[model samples]
Target: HHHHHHMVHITLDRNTANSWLIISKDRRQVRMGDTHQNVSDNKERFSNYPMVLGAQRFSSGKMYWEVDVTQKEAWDLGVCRDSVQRKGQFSLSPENGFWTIWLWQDSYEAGTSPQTTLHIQVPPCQIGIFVDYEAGVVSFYNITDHGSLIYTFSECVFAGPLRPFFNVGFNYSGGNAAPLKLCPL
Candidate 1:
């Protein structure tokens, strides 16, 4: 899964009540492109979510992971409304729940790494990251963080590629909004 000079994008839609990621690996590779969506709620449906489209499965190297928190897309990362309170945990409720998008490197040989969380109150926008998966490191940041060091995960693994089949994940995060619906974009 090698991508050349091309941009891939996925969107969260609410009208259809679906969560999906649209991937445009590259123009020369696959001109038409592809889209991946999540339909079921079974926890086992996907082994792990890919923080960035081409993080681990593509290759073992340094990559960046990022997402939109306060985005008003078709859907939102509505784990909980009390995002500030949840701090560092995955929740299902609106209050006391903070949403997070992560990049994982899953492997039995990979040791258990401590989960690290950071909090920041900023306007609705996208977040980016600079990740070193082979080194078991994940660095997170906000749009304003602007290549600055925000959060670091010393004990991390690329979990999405090691799934039963392919991995699926939601596109939007942050706020108490529902998942997005999909349409031709």
Candidate 2:
């Protein structure tokens, strides 16, 4: 698809990160910290989850970015409306401004109105996210499988700018503790 060539550079935003998440210096990687840090639990930060937002924002046009979820057994990645609440628990669905696909204990699920289970034959080591603001679409791809289409959120109406979102789910003891790298290309 033509959306394959619209790759864009995205970096993690530490300012909006939860206290338990660790962001790399270059802002390209994020992972759960071994120990909790004494960071402020401000309104802009996610208090109960290990989530982080992207430094870049997309208002219009199509944009794509790839994430390296190689060793991460449990994590969530995709896009969300800029106005999404970061404080407490919220529905992880498009109706609540979140459009994401999650991998937990080897199973894949997309955060739609009713989250859907995905049966991708090959486990995706790298995930590609494509967002078309004007077209109202958000598609995820298996970059490790020649950009195989995984799931898509079509006919989405944006309330504002969309940002890359990530969440290293709280399954630290289930062999799911690993860094989520934002790969180039």
Per-candidate TM-scores read 0.37, 0.95
Error of 2 at 119 (Å): 1.8
Candidate 1, poorest ten consecutive residues by summed lDDT = 25-34
The alpha-carbon lDDT assigned to residue 21 of candidate 2 equals 83
Off by over 4 Å in 2: none
User: Residue-wise lDDT of candidate 2 within 1-185, one digit each (tens)?
Assistant: 55758889898888899888888888898878777767776777887788899989899998988889887778889999888998767878988899899987778999976889997998989998899899999999998888889998899988899999999877647676778998976
lDDT (0-100) at residue 71 of candidate 2? 76
Model 1: number of clashes? 20
Residue 140 of candidate 1: its Cα lDDT? 45
Best-fitting candidate, measured by TM-score? 2
Give me the candidate number with maximum lDDT.
2
lDDT of 1 at 30: 9
lDDT of each: 0.29, 0.86
